[PDB]
Amino acid sequence: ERDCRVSSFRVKENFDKARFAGTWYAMAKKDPEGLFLQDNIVAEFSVDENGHMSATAKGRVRLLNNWDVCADMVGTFTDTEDPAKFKMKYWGVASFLQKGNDDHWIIDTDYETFAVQYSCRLLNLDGTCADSYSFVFARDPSGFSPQVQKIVRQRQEELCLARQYRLIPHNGYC
Amino acid sequence: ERDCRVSSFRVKENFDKARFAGTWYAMAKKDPEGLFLQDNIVAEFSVDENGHMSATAKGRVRLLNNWDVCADMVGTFTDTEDPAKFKMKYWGVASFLQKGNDDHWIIDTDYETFAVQYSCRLLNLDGTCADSYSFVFARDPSGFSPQVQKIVRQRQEELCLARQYRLIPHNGYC
Amino acid sequence: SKCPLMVKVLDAVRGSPAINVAVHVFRKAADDTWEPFASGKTSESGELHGLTTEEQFVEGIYKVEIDTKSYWKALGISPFHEHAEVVFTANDSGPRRYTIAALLSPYSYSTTAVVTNPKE
Amino acid sequence: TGESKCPLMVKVLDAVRGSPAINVAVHVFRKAADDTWEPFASGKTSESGELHGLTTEEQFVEGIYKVEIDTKSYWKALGISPFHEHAEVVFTANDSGPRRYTIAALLSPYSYSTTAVVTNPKE
Amino acid sequence: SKCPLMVKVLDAVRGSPAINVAVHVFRKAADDTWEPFASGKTSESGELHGLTTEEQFVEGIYKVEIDTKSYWKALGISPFHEHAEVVFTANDSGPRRYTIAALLSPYSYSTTAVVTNPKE
Amino acid sequence: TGESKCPLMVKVLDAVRGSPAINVAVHVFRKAADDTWEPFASGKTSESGELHGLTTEEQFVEGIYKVEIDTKSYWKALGISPFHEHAEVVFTANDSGPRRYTIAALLSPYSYSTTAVVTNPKE
């Protein structure tokens, strides 16, 4: 066994919001059920004087009638008792893009190189997450070092998402 | 004084329903406030075996963007305490034409040659009609005999709309 | 047709029927209370069909309320309208055929009536 | 007037008589705490077919509003029996801050269309 | 059992099908000459039908022109529209079933396409 | 001008995105003497999606005109494969003198709507 109850997942100890601040390139994402950013994701996190964290993010989504759409979203984060877990309200610069509240846990991140992200949307009765996305964010868009790569593969299995992650091209579709 | 309360008003003594039955060409009408039939007006009265009177008028009405529709109505009456006063439900063969529950007072009629018709829609506080329409019917297209014409001028003043009546051109719009 | 009321829904964006929209007819009762009248999901052909009988469609102010937003959330676009409503008085002059047809797009919609009298 | 600010704005039109649906009775409702459409604001359309300044930006809060347009009256007072009891537009307003809602409508006896125009203030 | 092209018209003012409208389908051809294709008057139900065959439906730049003016004139209202057009390149990816519906009122109209794929 | 002195006038709205359809190339034709649609006027819709000041009262002559909105370009440059080649509001103008024509349009992929508002100058 493994314990895949969203309740037993260790996230970042002592998260410094003003040390996660900055551009993170998405590298592999785990898809939820529903419409998600297909590829080209880049998140830009900034913490303002009154301690809050805000994120804006660009990415391609193939809006059903099949257009394919670079969507800039905006997110404003509310803190919780854990410094590494928050609620996100998201929305788009264009009113037709998806608004919501997604959990947004930083599972791990050495702020100069990586960060796993996770968010559970629907939780199953026994506690395992029923609907969930996760991003592996690198700080340099080439990928990231093998060492930090080996920390992240690890983490991915602790969350029970190992073998569900797929790659993101960055090709310049925005 | 003249006694113009819609209570003071003498109407038909003992109205035979099945006498009034038949086609009556309107000759003069006293307009209400609103869209009313402009000219070319003809009723046709009938009373089916269970003594219910239904009537059907045709008549030219200039519906506001200025189209002269030739409105076919239908009227289905319900009787009251009085034999000469009824409550009349009306509507068109066309969905788009007016619908209502109107008043329909026979003021007088010699069933073979004429009729004054009354309907008050809004009473006043004091009792005067705030809004009436009165049709003078003739039973012959031509106009009608001066003797009975004398009868209906008289009545009109006892009803107080008198001096407010207008001629109807029947010039085959339908 | 011998269809008391009847709804059609169409996707102006994808030029196809709006399949599986949750149409909810309501009939305002005696005291302004929109008591639940009837409900269905649009077919392959965009049509709800059979939602009452002539003895069950009574002279009243009816409401058809189309679930427009769940149509667009499950397509991944944030629509404008919470849902679409057609509030109409009915069967006062006996002409029992009513067809309501709607035309959906994210920030716009239209709805037309086609009131046809049965056989008087 | 406003300078240009107009959070909630209604425009009504007559596709039968090519012109402004003058003097319509709009009743903007805000659904409150327990499914009760609590009366929010009300008015009559101008010569230009526009109600204006129904609320301030400090009164327009994140909630499901409802612009209800009295169409039947527009028609009754024109001599045609309309299909529609009235025209509504029920919309969750100010979630993402983009305050400017223009609801424009296009009437005729047995059909109506509505379109929203949601423009951002200066973010 | 089919109808490649198919037209439905509706009177928004009198809540009824637009009976006996003169529809006129064209087919632009080789050198921007809109060569006449097909014509018909809308039935009791409001539908022009069978305006062509599949092996007569070639590819792209078709047109259906509806004679609205004639409808409004022959009702006594001074319309704002000379007539309605639905210019569409209809045949490309082979989905033959086109159904153009229209709604007409004196100073406004709106029309929609319902293109459904045959059996691929 | 000041406000409204503008004879012809076009406005276009995006019924998919909730906003002004900015930069649509609106061509105005004017049929001439023998069924030859002469080119009359042209333009692009502004930030409020308005084309404005397409002609002068002394050039807007009695006859058929046509405003032609290039829709497919709008839809092409947004990544949707649209149904409609373009939109046209063909209209016999100025006969009884009432100059002010406003053609607003509403654009989606497989439908569009348009409405004419003709308001009389000052008789």
From Swiss-Prot, chains A, B:
Omega-N-methylarginine carried by residues: R121
Protein name: Retinol-binding protein 4
Positions of substrate binding: Q98
Alphabetically ordered keywords of this record: Disease variant, Disulfide bond, Methylation, Microphthalmia, Retinol-binding, Secreted, Sensory transduction, Signal, Transport, Vision, Vitamin A
Organism whose genome encodes this protein: Homo sapiens
PROSITE patterns for the chain: LIPOCALIN (PS00213)
GO biological process: cardiac muscle tissue development; detection of light stimulus involved in visual perception; embryonic organ morphogenesis; embryonic retina morphogenesis in camera-type eye; embryonic skeletal system development; eye development; female genitalia morphogenesis; gluconeogenesis
GO molecular function list: molecular carrier activity; protein-containing complex binding; retinal binding; retinol binding; retinol transmembrane transporter activity
Gene name linked to the record: RBP4
Main localization of the protein described in the UniProt heading: secreted
UniProt family annotation: Belongs to the calycin superfamily. Lipocalin family.
Disulfide bonds: C4-C160, C70-C174, C120-C129
Domain of life assignment: Eukaryota
Tissue-level expression: Detected in blood plasma and in urine (at protein level).
UniProtKB/Swiss-Prot annotation, chains D, F:
Full protein segment contained here: 25 to 147 of 147
Recorded consequence of changing V26L: In AMYLD1; amyloid polyneuropathy
Name by which UniProt lists this protein: Transthyretin
Disease / disorder: Amyloidosis, hereditary systemic 1: A form of hereditary systemic amyloidosis, a disorder characterized by amyloid deposition in multiple tissues resulting in a wide clinical spectrum. AMYLD1 is an autosomal dominant form due to transthyretin amyloid deposition. Protein fibrils can form in different tissues leading to amyloid polyneuropathies, amyloidotic cardiomyopathy, carpal tunnel syndrome, systemic senile amyloidosis. The disease includes leptomeningeal amyloidosis that is characterized by primary involvement of the central nervous system.
GO molecular function: hormone activity; hormone binding; identical protein binding; molecular sequestering activity; protein-containing complex binding
Effect recorded for V67A: In AMYLD1; amyloid polyneuropathy
Phenotype for F83M: Loss of tetramerization
Consequence the record notes for mutating D14E: In AMYLD1; amyloid polyneuropathy
PTM entry text: Not glycosylated under normal conditions. Following unfolding, caused for example by variant AMYLD1 'Gly-38', the cryptic Asn-94 site is exposed and glycosylated by STT3B-containing OST complex, leading to its degradation by the ER-associated degradation (ERAD) pathway.
Binding site for L-thyroxine: K11, E50, S113
Modified positions (Sulfocysteine) in chain numbering: C6
Gene Ontology CC: azurophil granule lumen; extracellular exosome; extracellular region; extracellular space; protein-containing complex
Effect of G43R: In AMYLD1; amyloid polyneuropathy
Further remarks about this protein from its record: Tetramer dissociation and partial unfolding leads to the formation of aggregates and amyloid fibrils. Small molecules that occupy at least one of the thyroid hormone binding sites stabilize the tetramer, and thereby stabilize the native state and protect against misfolding and the formation of amyloid fibrils. Two binding sites for thyroxine are located in the channel. Less than 1% of plasma prealbumin molecules are normally involved in thyroxine transport. L-thyroxine binds to the transthyretin by an order of magnitude stronger than does the triiodo-L-thyronine. Thyroxine-binding globulin is the major carrier protein for thyroid hormones in man.
Keywords in alphabetical order: Amyloid, Amyloidosis, Cytoplasm, Disease variant, Gamma-carboxyglutamic acid, Glycoprotein, Hormone, Neuropathy, Phosphoprotein, Secreted, Signal, Sulfation, Thyroid hormone, Transport
Residue positions with a glycan: N94
Free-text tissue specificity from the UniProt record: Detected in serum and cerebrospinal fluid (at protein level). Highly expressed in choroid plexus epithelial cells. Detected in retina pigment epithelium and liver.
UniProt-reported outcome of changing A32P: In AMYLD1; amyloid polyneuropathy
